[PDB]
């Protein structure tokens, strides 16, 4: 078994912590069973969080894997080695200014802004702004909501692909977490561990990590999507309650 | 007489550029006619195009004078004299994120944008981008049309004040192109030179220096507001034909 998670809102709560969640991950960890991040997040702000690899950034963009994994796969990069599944954020960028010619409009993202903006649109401290500036594949967009579709739009004519998570709007090309999970379960050393996943989230940007896993579990707000199990609770206790009735009972 | 003039789209062709005005102003010069720049840009963009004291900046947010001004006013500041009419943009800034609360969504300007993004926004240099984010007074906001009305409400709720210019909305406290030029006239050495004063200008900010001159020239695109005199063509033609036709004659 390997446990896909998001974190923004499902894994962490409001302020970026476990809370409930801190006691179901021990308890995974206990009988053994990996749990992999699957996040919107930057690879720095994974790090700042204790997660050791393997995780999944920037919407399925990277794939991090210890330097030492039993597969081979990806560049060597210090105490990784990363799988690149999608273009490189500067690329984005420069499709980014197409696209604003296009919609003969400003279309500002994180790369536009002070860390000290940053912090403030997403309640994060400067420096957790600043991890969230570091993106090597996917732009996180700020969009007022009435110019959304427009902008939408025009990335896709550009080229770029787009999602949103909790809160924000994306733009990138080939970062797809579904596609990322499909690749690591692909390069797991043990295919009997990987045989059996289980995928957790909240938003848009979770719907191909559902589609990617043998049991998708839904913890935002609302009804869950077709297929999806729902949890009382949303966020970390959906996804305490998620281990607890869905997972322990099988291990 | 002392001629008080706006500077994008009035004193500057759309390269914010002198070149094509150099005619005119030396015109002016040569009659021993002051010209004062009265403009929303900084004291570095000021300066950046070799315009000298006294000259005011930030839509009359600071009254620069000449170190020697023979009347003492202000306070020293950098080979200057500097008379602060507006809060400063700290202030005004705080003030701005009470106005975010109200509306429920960002509201974004020149302080939360790098030089790079500005640069990209108005289509000044990089360099030049960041004299323009050099404010000491005024925020130049960069919004949504969409959102342009709920964002001005918003300010107003928080006591901000604004305005707009040729092309971006702006936000301070006390700063007015009127007042402004009222407190230069009084602070005038020569008392007969300050008598007969004019002003150019093509934007909604010059209203105010329009009620504050006894002759006003509207070298904007529309239709001129009421008690402004027109002009054939708009911008720098404009501040030429205004100085040949309005103003020669009367010297
Ligand atoms: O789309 C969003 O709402 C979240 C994921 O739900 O990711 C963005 O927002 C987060 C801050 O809330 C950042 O940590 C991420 O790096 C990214 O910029
Ligand atoms: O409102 C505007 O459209 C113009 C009019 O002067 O000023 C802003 O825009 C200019 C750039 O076009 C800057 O040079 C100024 O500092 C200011 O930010
Ligand atoms: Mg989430
Ligand atoms: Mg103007």
């Given at each position: 078994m390997i446990?896909?998670?998001?974190?923004?809102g499902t894994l962490l709560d409001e302020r970026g912590e476990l809370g409930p969640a801190r006691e179901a991950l021990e308890r995974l960890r206990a009988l053994g069973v990996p749990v992999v991040p699957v996040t919107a997040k930057t690879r720095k702000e994974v790090e700042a969080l204790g997660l050791e690899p393997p995780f999944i950034v920037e919407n399925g963009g990277g794939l991090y894997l210890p330097r030492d994994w039993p597969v081979r796969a990806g560049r060597?990069?210090?105490?990784?080695?990363?799988?690149?599944?999608?273009?490189?954020?500067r690329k984005v960028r420069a499709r980014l200014r197409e696209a604003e010619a296009l919609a003969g409009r400003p279309i500002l993202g994180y790369?536009?802004?002070?860390?000290?903006a940053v912090?403030?649109?997403?309640?994060?401290?400067?420096?957790?702004?600043?991890?969230?500036?570091?993106?090597?594949y996917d732009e996180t967009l700020v969009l007022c909501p009435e110019e959304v579709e427009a902008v939408l739009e025009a990335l896709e004519a550009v080229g770029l692909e787009w999602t949103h998570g909790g809160r924000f709007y994306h733009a990138a090309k080939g970062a797809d977490k579904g596609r990322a999970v499909a690749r690591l379960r692909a390069l797991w050393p043990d295919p009997e561990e990987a045989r059996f996943a289980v995928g957790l989230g909240d938003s848009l940007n979770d719907l191909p990590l559902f589609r990617a896993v043998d049991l998708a579990v839904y913890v935002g707000?609302?009804?869950?999507?077709?297929?999806?199990?729902?949890?009382?609770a949303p966020?970390?206790?959906?996804?305490?309650?998620?281990?607890?009735?869905?997972?322990?009972?099988?291990?």
């Open positions: 446990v896909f998670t998001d974190l923004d060597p990069k210090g105490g990784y080695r990363v799988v690149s599944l999608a273009w490189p954020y790369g536009d802004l002070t860390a000290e912090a403030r649109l997403t309640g994060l401290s400067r420096e957790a702004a600043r991890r969230a500036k570091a993106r090597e707000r609302g009804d869950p999507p077709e297929g999806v199990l729902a949890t009382p966020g970390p206790e959906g996804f305490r309650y998620a281990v607890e009735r869905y997972l322990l009972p099988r291990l």
